[model samples]
Structure formats: structure tokens, C-alpha cells
Target: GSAMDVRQSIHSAHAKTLDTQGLRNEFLVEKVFVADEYTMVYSHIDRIIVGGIMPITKTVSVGGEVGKQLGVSYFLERRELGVINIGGAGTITVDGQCYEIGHRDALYVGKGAKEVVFASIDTGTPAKFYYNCAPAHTTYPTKKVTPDEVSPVTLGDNLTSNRRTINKYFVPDVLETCQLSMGLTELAPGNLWNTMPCHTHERRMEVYFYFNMDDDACVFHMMGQPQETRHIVMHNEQAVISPSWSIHSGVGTKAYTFIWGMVGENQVFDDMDHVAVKEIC
Candidate 1:
């Protein structure tokens, strides 16, 4: 867990002098996936919190008081959650009935979906359920999503060498929400870069959790202003928090998988300030 928790700023302070490294250290939790148990980190930025549950034996249910830390009665009283199963076979129970979620599947527990619990079908192989929770104004339907339901879109090209396909589990285009957007991206073989020519959306703060990596491999995650970009070395199940002013992008030593979640001013996908890679320094 290093030194980060949930409910921290989604944007790094630039107007005020920044301890950029410290900001990162405070808001992000890297290396979150463990064999069994739960890993949760809450960020103040956009009040967006991400947590992981890998249940091998007993079902893993976190403390309800954890929501009190965010000033709410229950977990979904004023926030909604989205989850992706990136591990082995699993079943997520909302209220009661189990929703069988396999690798790459997603589930959305809208605001008011109380008692959100998780478990793995197989006691030996952990079920990795990656989740994001954001402040919400209303409740939506709770549902499960398979890869077939997370509409896919191909972006980038082999020519530029950034080819990848985005599987949108939750998006403004797919459903309605207070202000949360999420997706999973898989880079094609030989493609190492993602969100190249990345831009910042002053309205939204984003986090990308990288997974499915070779143990020793790492990703040079790019951030900071276009003129003053900085990078972080990331490994499996690690994530980077990009505030409003900085761009979010990455180049991995090997092929990897990542889940991106954004929340802020508005949940508009086209509200970004795209920067040409050539313009970054």
C-alpha cells in the first residue's frame, strides 16, 4: 500500500507550489493486487476511490464505516461504484444473488446498491475485482457486464505503433451517471504506447490501474504539464493518478492491461485538451 488512501485531490496543485512527488505518494496506491483479501485506496480528488478484492476463501466485505470516512451513511448513499474482474472466475453478490463475473467482465453497483459484497468461485484462485467509486447525485440500475457488453472501439494505428482497442464497460455513451466514466484498454502485440499525444481535461481527474504484466516488467507512466512532463515507473497491478492539469499516458516494457476511471466537473468524454506528442517536452 506504500502511502496512499482514498479521497485525495484528482489534480496536482500547480497554481500553488507543488511537491509533485509528494502529491503522487499521497493520492495513489501502487501494487494493489494480492492473492486474497481486499486492497482499497481512497482519493480526495473528485472523491473517487478505487479498491481491489481478491477473495479466495471467505467473501471479502469491507467495513461500512469506510463510507463514513467520505461523509456518507452507507457506501452508496451518495456515491456509485464500478468494478472489473481482471482475475480468475468470480461471483459478486449485490444485496443477495450472485452475479457470475469472469475475467474481463464488469459490474456496476449504482448509488443505493447497499451491502456490496464479493467472493471467488474457486477458493484457491483469487478473484480480482477492481472498483472505482465516485460522488453521486442519483441512483442508477445495478448490472453486470461481460466483454461482449462492453462495446469495443479500436484506436491508434500500427503505423504510429500505438494500436489498441478500448473496451468500454461504463461510459456516458453507454449509461447515465452522476459523473463517472470507466474503461479497459488492451494494447495489441508490439504496441507499447497508449494515450500518446495525451491531453488534460481540467474538468476531470483520472486514474489508470495497470495489470496483466510480466512480474519484472515496468511502465514509464507520463504525467505533468506538456512543457514539464514527468514519469513514474509502474509494475503489475499498479496505477497512476493524473490530476486535471497534467496529461496521462504510458509506454510499457511489455504488453499490459489497464483500467481507466475519470470523475470531475462533468462526465463528458470529448471535453479533453489534446496535446500533440511533438508538443510535449
Candidate 2:
């Protein structure tokens, strides 16, 4: 079985007035991976779809019904999908061709793919497919990206508690996609902050999915206008949506990993409005 939720776009003024629960309701994706099902959240902001697929006992497929929702013949008929397997090994079959996706491996399914199926290699340690989809105008060749294939950029400082390594999977420099770019960042053992001295890109909106933490750990995900900042407490394997008008940053109780997916006006990685720490309220 599969489930999908619609999240309406929120303006800056309206977002600023929201309370804690209100903020979570508007931006936080409390659940991403559900065993043996497809859990999806369709956000009105830039028309991006964020969700997860965990195939435990049987193969889970995404198409037809989703196409009905978008008024297309099939799911990827007008959309592109980026998938990163964060759990056990799995096989993703796209229109009869199968690709093995291991832990941390990513696959980009270009537009026009009619059949998309997911299954785990082992039922005991089911594969968890964390994904993001964006409206695509053209089709690009489907490709699989392994961590070793892409150069990892290490940044931040141990003293500042923000050191991390960023892996770019579906960006322009790596490959070609309509407008979606996805990547993963892993904080060092003792580091707890990500995107400190945070930024906002008026040209694009993004979604951040955090994982690699103990059950009790949480990340204080910062959002809202830089000056009128707010946070939504996030648990492991959860995600948060960031509008182009808000700053997206977080500090966790312990080190963790997060995948960021962006879609909008541009694909430049550094195109952002940098906000100094002192300017944050």
C-alpha cells in the first residue's frame, strides 16, 4: 500500500505567524520510511515530492495512481526522480531494467520512465529508499551513482563542531537532470552543526532529510526568515521543507547525516544569501 499527503505553499508572512505545531504542520515531514509501503509528501513549494519506500516482504511499486494524481499517464511521464538507498541493499527496476542499489548509493530515474519498482535483497534487513521528485520538462538517461564515483568535499572545522563531508549525487557537475539536485552530507563524529552561518537562496527551495542518529537524538531544524527564525524538533529519518525565503540550518544533539534536495530557478550550489550568526534572532 502507498500513501501521499499534500502540503500547500506558505508565504513568508504566514510562516512567521505559525506556532511550533503550525510550523511542523507546514514544513516538517515527520515520517519518510514506512516498512513495505510508499510514503510520499507532495509539497506545493516548487512542486517537489519527498518520501520513502521500504520493501520488506514484497516489491513496492510507484506509478499509475500517482500518475492519476498528476493527470499524466504514468508517474515519471512529467517528473524526474532521485533515490538514495539509506538502508539494506536493493534492486530498482525501471521499465524492465534492474539496477542494484546498495547502502548510500543513489539512482536518478529520468522523466518518461513508465515502470518503477523497488525490492530488498534481504527481507530481514529491508532496503529503505529515500527519494525526492521534481517536475521535469525533458528526459535524461537514468544513471546510478556510487559514493566512490563522485569526489567528496570535506569542509567545516572540528573546533566549530560543523566538520562534514558532502557527496554530490545528481547535480549538474555530476550529471544532468531537469531541475532537481540531490546530495548527502555526513558530520564528523563530534560535529553537530550543519550549514552554520546559514543561508537562503531566493532562487530555489530545498528539503533536508536527516538520519544516522540514535532513537532519542534530535535535530533543532532552523527555518523562517533569517531575522525571525524558528525551529522544528526533528527525529531520525525525518525531513523538513525550506522555502526560498527561509534559512535552513540545524544543530543536532550528536553527529548525524542529512540528504538535501533542491529544485527551482537555478542549480548553482553556492548561489545563496549568506546570513551571519549575529544577524539571526
Candidate 3:
């Protein structure tokens, strides 16, 4: 029942003067999972909530305190959620319907759901559910998306060291959502760069969560403006917030997979201002 909610505020212009620690405090979520706990960061950027649920010995549900925090009767009273299981197998019960979510499996629960619970299938290897939520006005059907169900868009070149498979899970082409778009990108072995030749979109803000990495592996997550870019060293299961005006990209020492979620005025995937490599400072 214990959860940590972090409130963050940042002005695009003020971001340029921040030092290393200041930038991290503004955009980085150093820890998202704790032993049998629910931790979330409430970002003022689009009212998005990104967090994780790690259930070990017992079942865990969205706390009522969250509803009280938002002045609603329930957590999903006016919000929608997207969850991806990053650990072993798990069970997610939404309004009484149980969905078995295996590793890499995703579930989209629309607004208005009264009851939601998460539990692990095995106590030895518990389930880690990484999730993101945003305000929703329309009620859409709850859907569970599997890796096989999503068609992968293979992009990048081996020469560029960014070869990867992009899986569009909670996208408009796959399902209907109010204002959330989420997908996963897996870097091929020996390929480490993602979103190279990066781009920025003023219409939306994005959150990137990295996982499936060794303890020693480090991902230099790139953010900031096109000409004044900066990097944040990321570890496994950590997430970063990218404002609409900043570029988002990363390069890892070892192969890793990351889940990307965006919320804002539009869901068009093609709506981005691509920046050339030479444009980054």
C-alpha cells in the first residue's frame, strides 16, 4: 500500500542552466521498482504517471489513496493505463476478468474500471509490471497485447549500430486510446543505438523505460534541445522523461530493450521534427 509519488516541474528555458544533478532531478526516475511496492512519478507534463508494480507474496491493487489524491472515487475514474510485464509470468485482474501476462506481454485498461489487481504467478520469480497512465475522456475496451500479435517495424542499419525491432503495442493502428501511445524497441545483439538521427515533437512528451540489461550495462539516454543535448546514464528498469521540445535517444554498452510511451495533443507517429546528427551539440 506504500507508494512514492514524485512531483516534477521544469521550464524548457530553465533546463539549459541545470547541472548534472539538477537535470537528473528534473527528468530522471532513478528507481521505479522496489520490493513488493508500487512507486510512481506524477509528471506535470501532460499529467502522466509512470511507475511499476512488483508483487511478491501477495496481491496488490491500486490504492484508494490515489483516488483521493485525484479527487475521484477510484484511480481509473478519469484515467487510462498501459502495463507491460517485465519479469516472470503474472496475473492482472481488471474488473474481475483475469489476464495472464507473461514476459513482454502488455495490457491496456481503459478508463472507468473499478477494480484492478496484480499478482505474481510464482513467488520465486515475481512479476514486475511497468505502467504509464494519462487522463482519459473516452471509455475504450480493455485489451491485452502480446508480442506475437504486434508486427515489428525493423529499422536502422548494422553499419549505424542501431538495428532494432520496433513493436507497436498501444498505438492507434492497433487499438483505440484517448491520448496515449506506447511501444517497445529491442536492440539487436551488437547493435546499441536507438532513435539515432533523433527527432523531437512539440505536440507530445515521451517517457522511455529501459530494461533487459545486465547489471554492468549502461545506457546513455540522450535528451535536451537539438543543439544543446545532454545525456543521462541509465540502468536496468530505469525511466526518463522527455519533454516535447527535447530530443530523445540512447546508446547502450550492451543490448537492451526499452518501452516508450507518449502523451499529448496528437498520436500521429509521423509527427516529429527530425534532427540531423550534425545538428546536435
Candidate with the greatest TM-score versus the true structure: 2
Q: Each candidate's lDDT (Cα)?
A: 0.79, 0.92, 0.90
Task: Give lDDT: candidate 3, residue 140.
Answer: 99
lDDT of 3: 0.90
Q: Candidate 3: worst 10 consecutive residues by lDDT?
A: 1-10
Q: How would you encode candidate 1's per-residue C-alpha lDDT over 141-211 as one tens digit per residue?
A: 88788888767889888787689999988886677777888899999887889888798998888999998
Q: How many pairs in model 1 have backbone atoms within 3 A of each other, for residues 3 or more apart or on separate chains, i.e. clashes?
A: 13
Top of the candidates by lDDT: 2
Model 3 TM: 0.96
lDDT score, residue 79, model 1?
Answer: 83
RMSD of each: 2.7, 1.1, 1.3
C-alpha-based local distance difference test score of model 2: 0.92
Choose 2 or 3, whichever is better by lDDT.
2
TM-score of every model versus the real structure: 0.91, 0.98, 0.96
| Deviation (Å) of 281 in candidate 3 | 5.1
* Candidate 1 local lDDT, residue 164: 93
Across residues 115-167, which tens digit of lDDT does each residue of candidate 2 receive? 89999999988899999999999999999999998889999999999899999
Q: After superposition, how far is residue 236 of candidate 2 from its true place, in Å?
A: 0.7
